[PDB]
């Protein structure tokens, strides 16, 4: 009966662990220390942005390194022009509770979602000149916490239903569903080639999925608590993630292994947002305290201790060209750092 | 021209500080509890207005389980309404530990919890038709005249255990009571006034 159905489970679990240990060897600490480290760097804010009304939850950069989109609990989306610090559009959301927002690669559409269980698509280049609802994505029994535009017509959304979904804007019907997650999933990142995307759930497990094949390829379980953020390395063969247990972990897709960790004894709060630089040398991770700490992706050294937010940071992002990094906290303040 | 863009930004800012002045008096509230609790007796919204101020109620029920990941969005709510079935006994336990998962939950240690137990009439009709055995009714609370004290001791025990599990600091305080009404809105108004008055002293260093 069912008695024969679990034996091979831990049999292949032990196979995975043994294969990983065999392919593993002496760590990269003795290799990365050869080169001179970047050291501590002083980074100052440039645009002390104001105008927001409530707690900021998520943000995203456009293809150009100038335009931004921000979401907040007040049910309003504001498009910011970073260079001149002025609002381009103001979208009044029907649902006040939103937790994610995204910018289309073409810059024509903006998506947002939250506790309303519906993903809202807004068109910015309409002929009428006023931003309006383009399409509402139904069929979600859990709160949506992360959405990213695969292209101008395909979107991928992470829900609170222990699954992720892919939607087409033209038809509005679900294309494929990824139900391999056994815990609440909130972090979702996409590779630069738009071929693979990772997702980390509350079960301290991050797994890789396929756009069209539609099942998990590799699974990583090095974390200890809920995964809050995940992001892809610029190269695309690796990714880094953060958790509520106050440590950042880097994983390699080809190695299918844990690849060193970022943590310190001086911080207890967990990580909220994770993002890399253009070259990936510097890893920028948020924290629940009042100071944001960035790490060396190859040395785990405290590169920056930049602060300036009266509340915890909830969102972070780096421009495509790597010119600047924008961070947002719960004090309705956005900061641009060069 | 940048002048027209600045004018548009100023107009958008003026519009932003026109709906936000209508949102600082909303006095939002969060309602959660067991399925069998009388949620409809008192995301779903309800509209009611008492004494020149409106109220905004959040009946979240579209989330699966654990309630601990989306609750961080409610960090800036004035008060939380917690409702359990008093007439029920078998499911009172994990309902009590449900309250533990809210009282001690992080990002939630600054908001008061208003207990709104119902089914007092059901409990009375059931009584009429282990720690409970050893107990006495505190003399501080005076029951209303003409009230059958067979259920009064049980109600006092429930209040005492609720206060005990609540007190297990002063920045946020539980208000345990019973109810079975037209004065529900009045009671909610008084409770909100009390919690706001307490919160004002926290900034005045008084």
């Amino acid at each position: 009966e069912l008695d024969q159905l679990r034996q091979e489970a831990e049999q292949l679990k032990n196979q995975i662990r043994d294969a990983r240990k065999a392919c593993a060897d002496a760590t990269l600490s003795q290799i990365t220390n050869n080169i001179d480290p970047v050291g501590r760097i002083q980074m100052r804010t440039r645009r002390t942005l104001r105008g927001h009304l409530a707690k900021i939850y998520a943000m995203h950069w456009g293809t150009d390194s100038r335009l931004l989109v921000s979401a907040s609990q007040d049910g309003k989306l504001i498009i910011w022009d970073s260079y001149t610090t002025n609002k381009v559009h103001a979208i009044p959301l029907r649902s006040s509770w939103v937790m994610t927002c995204a910018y289309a690669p073409s810059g024509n559409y903006v998506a947002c979602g939250g506790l309303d269980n519906i993903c809202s698509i807004y068109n910015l280049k309409t002929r009428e000149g006023n931003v309006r609802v383009s399409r509402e994505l139904a069929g979600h029994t859990g709160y949506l916490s992360c959405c990213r535009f695969l292209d101008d017509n395909q979107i991928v959304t992470s829900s609170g239903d222990t699954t992720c979904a892919l939607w087409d804007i033209e038809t509005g019907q679900q294309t494929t569903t990824f139900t391999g997650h056994t815990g609440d999933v909130m972090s979702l990142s996409l590779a630069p080639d738009t071929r693979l995307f990772v997702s980390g759930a509350c079960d301290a497990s991050a797994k890789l999925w396929d756009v069209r094949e539609g099942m998990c390829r590799q699974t990583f379980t090095g974390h200890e608590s809920d995964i809050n953020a995940i992001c892809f390395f610029p190269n695309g063969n690796a990714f880094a993630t953060g958790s509520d247990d106050a440590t950042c972990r880097l994983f390699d897709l080809r190695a299918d292994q844990e690849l060193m960790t970022y943590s310190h004894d001086n911080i207890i709060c967990g990580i909220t947002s994770v993002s890399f630089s253009k070259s990936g040398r510097l890893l920028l991770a948020g924290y629940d305290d009042f100071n944001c700490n960035v790490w060396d992706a190859l040395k785990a050294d405290r590169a920056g201790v930049l602060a300036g937010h009266d509340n915890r940071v909830s969102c972070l992002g780096v421009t495509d060209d790597g010119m600047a990094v924008a961070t947002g906290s719960w004090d309705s303040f956005l900061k641009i750092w060069n | 021209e940048d002048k027209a863009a600045a004018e548009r930004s100023k107009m958008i800012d003026k519009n932003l500080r026109e709906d936000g002045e209508k949102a600082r008096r909303t006095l939002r509230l969060l309602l959660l509890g067991a399925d069998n609790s009388g949620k409809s007796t008192i995301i779903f919204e309800t509209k009611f207005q008492v004494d020149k101020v409106n109220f905004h109620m959040f009946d979240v029920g579209g989330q699966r389980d654990e309630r601990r990941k989306w609750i961080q969005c409610f960090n800036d709510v004035t008060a939380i309404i917690f409702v359990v079935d008093s007439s029920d006994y078998n499911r009172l336990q994990e309902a009590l530990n449900d309250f533990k998962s809210i009282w001690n939950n992080r990002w939630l240690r600054t908001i008061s919890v208003i207990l709104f137990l119902n089914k007092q009439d059901l409990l009375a009709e059931k009584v009429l038709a282990p720690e409970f055995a050893r107990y006495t009714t505190p003399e501080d609370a005076t029951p209303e005249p003409g009230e059958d004290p067979r259920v009064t001791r049980a109600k006092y025990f429930i209040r005492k255990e609720f206060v005990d599990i609540s007190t297990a600091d002063g920045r946020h305080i539980c208000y345990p009571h019973f109810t079975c009404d037209t004065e529900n809105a009045r009671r909610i108004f008084n409770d909100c006034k009390d919690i706001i008055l307490q919160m004002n002293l926290r900034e005045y260093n008084l």
Partner: single-chain antibody
Amino acid sequence: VQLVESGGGLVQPGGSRKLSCSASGFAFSSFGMHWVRQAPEKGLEWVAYISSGSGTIYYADTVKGRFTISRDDPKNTLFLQMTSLRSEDTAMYYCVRSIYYYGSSPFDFWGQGTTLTVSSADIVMTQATSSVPVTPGESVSISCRSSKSLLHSNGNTYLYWFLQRPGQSPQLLIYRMSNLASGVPDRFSGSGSGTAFTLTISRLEAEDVGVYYCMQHLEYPLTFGAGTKLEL
């Protein structure tokens, strides 16, 4: 999205009248409005402007202190008042809706217009050509020269190209060099170095016959170039 003009007709010199235009299909409140005058057999010329919310208003030096403009958001109709009329005042009057932000397309739509008959030291640009005999089938290129460079230090220029079909309302093709507007084919392109600006067309169609107008938007005293017409 359409604009309808009213009023007009025959007015005695020195008379007063009010011009009203009706807008539908788009948000008038968020859109600024411009008035542009087209003298018969001559080029276009800007007249007046009103900003969103009526917070900023400009007038041309020719009609400064003489004409007034107003807008009514609830009934989405634009008001223009005429005080004194002369021989040079009569012309073709058009209403233009524009929005100013990053990635916007100012002067995208042009009104039908209404017919009116009667009984310095600013920027300016000229184009040497006025009309060239070219057949459809091959590329057509034109050049324009500006007295003062339009390359703002912000990063982009402010040259606008317009299309006027014979007997039809004007339309916009290129609002800035190297970025195409909506509703036009990809055969239209423009380039410039701040002094000499040129427009190149891949192929010439029958519907592309019209008058070419060049526009600057660096200084608000808008001045339009002399019309260049293409015929087959």
